[PDB]
């Protein structure tokens, strides 16, 4: 639902780019997003390409760059190493 | 996508009711489900009431009961403590 992160995998693109549990993704490449599925779409469809994020963390919005890597099960789609917030 | 548990939060209603990573939820309250979002609908809309699950684990189905608790960020919605696998 909401574009807020649960757990971040160790040594993942998400960890390397500075994402943390609890971050809310505000925008990707300047495009505002409101749905987790939109964030997932940007990840899966852009393997190897940097994504410029604005995230809300601890009451402030800050920029990050994260680059999806080739998913080990299907190298044609991107993987960041993130799970959505627990529901 | 699939109602298959990638992550189960520690000390959550999900853990306390016996759910484990890798379980697939087959039905809730006798109603078959096929989508993660359907399980989320049952959880979010039934805070504080038991849900009767059938779960598939290692090829066998078994009954479990879980009781969603009031969500942290929003105490009007139920929370179980589940997330899909990393993406």
CB-based contact B66:B72 (threshold 8 Å): no
Name the residue among A44, A82, A86 with its Cβ closest to that of B86.
Answer: A82
- Resolution of this structure in Å: 1.1
| Distant-in-sequence, close-in-space partners of B42: CB < 8 Å, separation ≥ 6 | B28, B29, B33, B51
Which one of B21, B51, B81, B87 would you mutate to disrupt binding with A, by most A Cβ within 10 Å of its Cβ? B87
CB-based contact A80:A20 (threshold 8 Å): no
Distances (CA, A) of A78 to A33, A41, A57, B32, B38: 18, 9, 24, 32, 26
Written in H, E and C, the secondary structure of A12-76 is CHHHHHCCCCCCEEEEECCEECCCHHHHHHHHHHCCCCCEEEEEEECCEEEEEEECCEECCCCCC
Rounded to the nearest angstrom, the gap between the alpha carbon of residue A86 and the centroid of all alpha carbons in its chain is: 15
CA distance B8 to A87: 10
CA distance B76 to B69: 10
Does the CB of A79 have a partner CB in chain B at under 8 Å? yes
CB-based contact B71:B9 (threshold 8 Å): no
CA distance B48 to A33: 31
CA distance A19 to A35: 17
CB-based contact A4:B80 (threshold 8 Å): no
Does the CB of B18 have a partner CB in chain A at under 8 Å? no
Structurally, chain A folds into a number of domains equal to: 1
| Domain coverage including residue B69 | 1-87
Method for this entry:
X-ray
Asked if A86's CB is within 8 angstroms of B79's CB, the reply is yes
Asked if A40's CB is within 8 angstroms of B86's CB, the reply is no
Rounded to the nearest angstrom, the gap between the alpha carbon of residue B61 and the centroid of all alpha carbons in its chain is: 15
End-to-end CA separation in angstroms for chain A:
9
State residue B59 phi and psi, 5-degree precision.
Answer: 85, 0
Q: What is chain B written as a DSSP string?
A: --SB-SEE-TTSHHHHTT--TT-EEEEETTEE---HHHHHHHHHT-TTS-EEEEEEETTEEEEEEE--EE-SS-TTSEE--EEPPP-
Asked if B85's CB is within 8 angstroms of A83's CB, the reply is yes
């Amino acid at each position: 639902g909401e574009p807020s992160l649960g757990l971040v995998a160790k040594d993942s693109p998400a960890e390397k780019g500075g994402l943390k549990v609890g971050d809310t993704v505000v925008s990707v490449n300047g495009e505002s997003i409101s749905l987790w599925s939109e964030f997932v779409s940007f990840i899966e469809n852009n393997p190897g390409k940097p994504l410029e994020l604005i995230v809300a963390r601890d009451g402030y919005q800050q920029p990050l760059v994260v680059t999806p890597e080739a998913n080990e099960r299907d190298r044609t789609i991107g993987y960041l190493g993130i799970s959505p917030a627990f529901q």
